[PDB]
PDB file of C-alpha atoms in Angstrom:
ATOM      1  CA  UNK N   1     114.516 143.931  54.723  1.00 33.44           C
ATOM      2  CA  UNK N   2     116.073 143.283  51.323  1.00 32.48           C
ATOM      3  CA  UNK N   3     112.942 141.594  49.979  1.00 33.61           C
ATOM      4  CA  UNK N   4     111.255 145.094  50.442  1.00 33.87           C
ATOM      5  CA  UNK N   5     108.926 144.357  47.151  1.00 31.17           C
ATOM      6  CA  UNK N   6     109.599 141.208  44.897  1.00 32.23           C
ATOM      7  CA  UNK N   7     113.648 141.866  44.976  1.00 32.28           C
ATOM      8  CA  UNK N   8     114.945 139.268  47.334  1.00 32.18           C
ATOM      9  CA  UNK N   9     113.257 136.790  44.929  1.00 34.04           C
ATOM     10  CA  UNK N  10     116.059 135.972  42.516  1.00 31.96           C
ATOM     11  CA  UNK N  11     117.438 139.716  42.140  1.00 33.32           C
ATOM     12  CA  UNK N  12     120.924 139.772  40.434  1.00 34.68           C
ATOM     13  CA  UNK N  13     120.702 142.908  38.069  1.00 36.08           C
ATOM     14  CA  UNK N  14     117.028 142.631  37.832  1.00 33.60           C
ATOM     15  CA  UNK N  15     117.303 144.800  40.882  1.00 34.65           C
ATOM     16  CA  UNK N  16     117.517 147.270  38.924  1.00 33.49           C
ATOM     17  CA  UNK N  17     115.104 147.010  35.989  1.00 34.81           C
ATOM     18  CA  UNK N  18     112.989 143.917  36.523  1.00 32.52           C
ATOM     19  CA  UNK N  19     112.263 145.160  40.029  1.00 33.38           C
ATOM     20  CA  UNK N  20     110.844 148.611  39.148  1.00 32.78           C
ATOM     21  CA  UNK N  21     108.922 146.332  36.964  1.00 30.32           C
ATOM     22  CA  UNK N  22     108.236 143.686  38.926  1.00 28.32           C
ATOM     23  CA  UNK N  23     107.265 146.199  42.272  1.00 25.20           C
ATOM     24  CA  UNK N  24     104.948 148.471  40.160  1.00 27.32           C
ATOM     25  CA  UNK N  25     104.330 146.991  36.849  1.00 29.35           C
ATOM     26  CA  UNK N  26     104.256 142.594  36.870  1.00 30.62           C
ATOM     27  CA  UNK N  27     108.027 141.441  36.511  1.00 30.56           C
ATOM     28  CA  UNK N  28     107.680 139.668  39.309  1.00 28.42           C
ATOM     29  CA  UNK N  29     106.664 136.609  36.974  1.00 27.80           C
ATOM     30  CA  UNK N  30     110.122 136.541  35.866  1.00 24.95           C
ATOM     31  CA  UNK N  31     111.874 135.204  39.109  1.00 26.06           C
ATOM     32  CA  UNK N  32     111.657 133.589  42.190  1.00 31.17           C
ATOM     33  CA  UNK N  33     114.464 131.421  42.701  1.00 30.56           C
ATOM     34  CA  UNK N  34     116.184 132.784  45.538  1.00 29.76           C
TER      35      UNK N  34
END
């Protein structure tokens, strides 16, 4: 689905950095509002 990792979470552009962050590194502790 979309939320494959964290990206469904909130993902606007963060998609794009924040989520190769958030899937590998921690980012994910930026967002969660969706």
């Amino acid at each position: 689905g979309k939320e494959k990792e964290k990206l469904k979470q909130c993902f606007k552009d963060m998609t794009l950095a924040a989520i190769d962050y958030a899937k590998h590194k921690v980012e994910k502790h930026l967002f969660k509002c969706i």
